[PDB]
Design a protein around this ligand. Structure first.
Ligand SMILES: [Mg+2]
Ligand SMILES: [Mg+2]
Ligand SMILES: [Mn+2]
Ligand SMILES: [Mn+2]
Ligand SMILES: [Mn+2]
Ligand SMILES: [Mn+2]
Ligand SMILES: [Mn+2]
Ligand SMILES: [Mn+2]
Lengths: 393, 392
């Protein structure tokens, strides 16, 4: 039904890039994989740095989207956002254009007060904004082709405080005098296992008589019927023994380890927007009941520290973090920025370009390779480098 | 009524006769009972307790401490009963048997890659659950009154496992530093789980409650007006027009030590309470409670502990009037006045903590330092010396 409907918004790259229609096509080169950076002739707020590169060939379009502007609540609200789309570009494009409007609307309900701690009203506003964005996608689903879904990582600076709201598996970290301050956590079948099992237990019909909510160390085989095995339930952190009993032969709700962890054999990320009609392969079981649009929000008070020109906030999609650790990013940032004149305004964009290049690697004979012959990232990669000096009181 | 599953009593290691128990239950004098010096506990653990100031005729705290045979396994436990002493008494005798049996399923292994620690944790988690299931079915044949919280510790193969299902608390004091070893399970700390369940299963509210949380009691006058609220998916607050459903009593009400689920109870985990209902109604509370504990591990081999490094276990009778910092300050000023070789050290430290929470009674209620109100609750304190857990 949705493939019969027009697009809500046309596909494109982040609008602040200012790319023509021909530059967009030139960027979608899976073999050359050109790293796009912000033109010096265009400045982002706070001289924010940005860089991106398309995937190595798994989807025709770059499915990351990004938005950055200064909102006005009828007070100023700086806004940065990254969306990692999957199974289509539609949700990430829609989110990159409309979520900031939901945030502005929710903040407007509480702005007289900003002038229960106020920080909890801003958190509540951001949480309501994520939900209302997903609700809008849900009902506009029937008039427009809003394909797939997306993760959502946004940050606002409001009255001297950074709010980092994450619903997905992108990541935000602060590098301050060389130390790593994490500002987000990822939501996967692994990190959300107990919530997912709890829902499956309380609402068994969501399992379509195809899955069991119990976790096992490996796939349970029919020949193990009547035998003892380790299992883990929703209220357990550890493992205990159990007699295998018919029901345990169903496919597990949670399966796989780390980046291979999956819910109902389908998805490896459990929060974001879209995916309303997503189904398990070869069945009619819906995935969305196990997904959530609700972000985790973390605050960084910019007043409690005097920030140098090399103290930055990094936002990136998993195209960076899947091959670079927080320590490699910290090492790279602190190694690069002291080579740029502190007054150079293109200097955080070059830092973001350096991060993308280190994760993308170079195209060798057997694929993309980074340092230590390691495999380079074949994904879309998008990176913000936000200089925290601009938030100094 | 039904026969008792066990006779009421006080911790066995107190070596009390029946006549000493009756004398100890003085709501006016409130004598502080301590481990006799002639009686040594594992690791020379200190223990002291005192009865409440009048809310229940019996002391509803219970405690048990022994060496389990699996390999040997040191075991300390504290239970804070409510609405009767039965559940606390049963748990103080039978939870160690459930723990012992769960550990026997995995003891060979201890001598996807599952770390051994996770097998111990899973064994404790299952033992709590199996204890509550035994209470649930023996409930019908024995008078096992009320419910109880459960805080237990085991030392197994060089590691401490602290498992908590309630609002008692365990902290380590190590070279003056406070090391928390448990978290409390209240309507407040468990709000999102509780709202989630009420939302997934609205019939549990019995058409008398709403799962939404509000900064204060929603009243008639607010109907149709804007008001802050918090749902299961929110940490912050947002505005909302009050509808007639928002007028029902909230599933979660109050804050801090005054937070309550279903207008009835201020702790959300433990054992028993299978038949606990909302007053004057057939709405059951137990679907919102959980017997599942949180387990924290302390590796004794990573630190060479001194004679004053201790693990404190106590029911809320202590923590409701003394912060972690006061307890730390109390222990670090008391113990340096005792010879490190004196086995009675930690018992005396335990008694000093109970006295500091209980206070002195005059004409203005029980008073502790700076004229603060003393604790009128049952109080039970363990002082576990970590020096006896040192490697080699
Ligand atoms: Mg005995
Ligand atoms: Mg000794
Ligand atoms: Mn993607
Ligand atoms: Mn990912
Ligand atoms: Mn990605
Ligand atoms: Mn009690
Ligand atoms: Mn309490
Ligand atoms: Mn108590």
């Amino acid at each position: 039904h949705m493939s019969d409907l027009p697009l809500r918004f046309p596909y494109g790259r982040p609008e602040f890039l200012g790319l023509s229609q021909d530059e967009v096509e030139a960027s979608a080169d899976h073999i050359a994989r050109p790293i796009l950076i912000l033109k010096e002739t265009r400045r982002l707020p706070w001289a924010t740095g940005y860089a991106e590169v398309i995937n190595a060939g798994k989807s025709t379009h770059n499915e990351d989207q990004a938005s950055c502007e200064v909102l006005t609540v009828k007070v100023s609200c700086h806004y940065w956002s990254l969306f990692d789309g999957h199974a289509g570009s539609g949700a990430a494009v829609v989110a990159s254009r409309l979520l900031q409007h939901h945030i502005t609307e929710q903040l407007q309900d509480i702005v007289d007060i900003l002038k229960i701690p106020h920080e909890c009203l801003v958190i509540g506003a951001l949480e309501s904004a994520f939900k209302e964005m997903d609700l809008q996608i849900e009902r506009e689903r029937s008039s427009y082709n809003i394909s797939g879904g997306c993760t959502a990582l946004i940050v606002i600076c409001l009255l001297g405080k950074l709010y980092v709201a994450n619903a997905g598996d992108s990541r935000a970290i602060i590098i301050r005098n060389g130390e790593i301050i994490p500002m987000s956590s990822e939501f996967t079948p692994e990190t959300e296992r107990q919530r997912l099992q709890y829902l499956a237990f309380m609402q068994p019909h969501l399992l379509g008589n195809e899955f069991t909510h119990l976790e096992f160390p490996r796939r349970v085989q029919r020949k193990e019927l009547g035998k003892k095995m380790l299992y883990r339930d929703f209220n357990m952190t550890g493992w205990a023994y159990k007699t295998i009993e018919d029901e345990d032969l169903k496919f597990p709700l949670i399966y796989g380890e780390g980046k291979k962890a999956r819910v109902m054999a389908t998805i490896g990320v459990t929060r974001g927007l879209g995916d309303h009609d997503l189904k398990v392969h070869d069945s009619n079981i819906y995935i969305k009941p196990f997904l959530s649009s609700a972000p985790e929000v973390r605050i960084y008070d910019l007043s409690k520290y005097d920030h140098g020109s090399d103290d930055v906030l990094i936002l990136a999609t998993d195209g960076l973090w899947d091959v670079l650790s927080n320590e490699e990013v910290a090492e790279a940032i602190t190694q690069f920025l002291p080579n740029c004149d502190p007054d150079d305004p293109h200097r955080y964009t070059l830092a973001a370009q350096d991060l993308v290049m280190r994760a993308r690697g170079v195209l060798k004979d057997r694929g993309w390779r980074i340092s230590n012959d390691r495999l380079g990232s074949g994904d879309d990669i998008s990176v913000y480098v936000i200089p925290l000096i601009h938030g100094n009181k």
